[PDB]
Amino acid sequence: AQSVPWGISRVQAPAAHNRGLTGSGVKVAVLDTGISTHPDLNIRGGASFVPGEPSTQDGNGHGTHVAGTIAALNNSIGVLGVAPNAELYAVKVLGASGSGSVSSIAQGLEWAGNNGMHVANLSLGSPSPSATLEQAVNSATSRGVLVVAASGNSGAGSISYPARYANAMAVGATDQNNNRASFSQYGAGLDIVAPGVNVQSTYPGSTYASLNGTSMATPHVAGAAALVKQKNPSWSNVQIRNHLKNTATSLGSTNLYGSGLVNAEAATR
């Protein structure tokens, strides 16, 4: 039996799937710890920029978790992603330890822009700005990639890099009450929010696990962007990014929530 995690239904993904929108033909790169082979995922390709782990398989579990929120297959097992037909690429920029260098992250973004990815999911971040990173963000953007990044889990009133950069779409996390989760960073540069508490998804060892973090909120928006792209194949990263914002549900302060909760129902109309 397949269950639909609460955040998937919170963002109204099923409403989009009932219209024929599942992310089919949209390429999404997950820059993280890798993606393990899983029966509820279809991994199309990828690369590792982690010296010492040439493989794209996930030794941490974080990337596999992220990937399942975007694109867990719509079938009779496990869970269901926001864009279950998206073409998934495993871009390994963090090691098993769950950390990596800006150098690896920059290479992964370059890779994405060279391989015609539509959306890049960066569920990672630093409190410190990086010129290398910023340049990579900007270069992927001008190659048509929509970069989506987590605001960070420090709970502070400023957001992480690269989500802080203008060309990154910064995602914070809400709870089941539609409140900002305590750990979700907010402040200037924050674009939108999505479910981030108790998120159930695919996990290595062919299983499922629930995690919390802005890292879990991000993939709901990457997924929502694939739905929109499928519906409006001619739209640019910018067009997609503003439509998501314009159609999000207001939750109170733009300081704490940016544009509001992403809404894939309102967006694919």
Nearer to Ca ion, 170 or 197 (CB): 170
Distance from C-alpha of 160 to C-alpha of 108, rounded to nearest angstrom: 19
Q: Which stretch binds Ca ion (CB under 5 A): 19-27, 59-67, 76-84, 227-235?
A: 76-84
Task: Please say if 58 is a catalytic residue.
Answer: no
Task: Please say if 32 is a catalytic residue.
Answer: yes
Residues that bind Ca ion (rule: CB under 5 A) add up to a total of 8
Q: What is the per-residue binding string for Ca ion in 167-186, x denoting contact by CB under 5 A? A: -x-x----------------
Task: Please say if 215 is a catalytic residue.
Answer: yes
For residue 220, report the phi and psi dihedrals to the nearest 5 degrees.
Answer: -65, -35
Query: What does the DSSP assignment read for 198-213?
Result: SEEEEETTTEEEEE-S
Considering only residues 103-132, where is the footprint of Ca ion by CB under 5 A? none
Q: Which stretch binds Ca ion (CB under 5 A): 1-9, 101-109, 212-220, 234-242?
A: 1-9
- Among 189, 195, 213, 219, the residue binding Ca ion under the rule CB under 5 A is 189
**73 binding Ca ion? (CB under 5 A):** yes
Q: Would you say 223 and 9 are in contact if contact means Cβ atoms under 8 Å apart?
A: no
- C-alpha torsion sign, points 88, 23, 245, 65: negative
Distance from C-alpha of 198 to C-alpha of 215, rounded to nearest angstrom: 12
3-class secondary structure per residue, 53-113: CCCCCCCCCHHHHHHHHHHCCCCCCCCCCCCCCCEEEEEECCCCCCCCCHHHHHHHHHHHH
The catalytically annotated residue of 17, 62, 118, 243 is: 62
**244 binding Ca ion? (CB under 5 A):** no
- Smallest separation (angstroms) from Ca ion to the CB of 89: 19
Name the binding residues for Ca(2+). 2, 40, 73, 75, 77, 79, 163, 165, 168
**78 binding Ca ion? (CB under 5 A):** yes
**265 binding Ca ion? (CB under 5 A):** no
Nearer to Ca ion, 8 or 47 (CB): 8
Name the binding residues. 2, 40, 73, 75, 77, 79, 163, 165, 168
- Smallest separation (angstroms) from Ca ion to the CB of 42: 11
- Among 2, 3, 97, 176, the residue binding Ca ion under the rule CB under 5 A is 2
Distance from C-alpha of 77 to C-alpha of 65, rounded to nearest angstrom: 16
The catalytically annotated residue of 160, 184, 215, 259 is: 215
Nearer to Ca ion, 100 or 189 (CB): 189
Residue with tokens 């900007």, as numbered in its chain: 138
**133 binding Ca ion? (CB under 5 A):** no
Is 28 in a helix, a strand, or coil? strand
- Residue 253: is it exposed, middle or buried by C-beta count within 10 angstroms (0-12/13-18/19+)? exposed
Distance from C-alpha of 12 to C-alpha of 7, rounded to nearest angstrom: 8
Residues facing 180 on adjacent strands: 174
Name the residues annotated as catalytic.
32, 62, 215
Q: Interface with Ca ion by CB under 5 A: which residues?
A: 2, 40, 73, 75, 78, 168, 170, 189
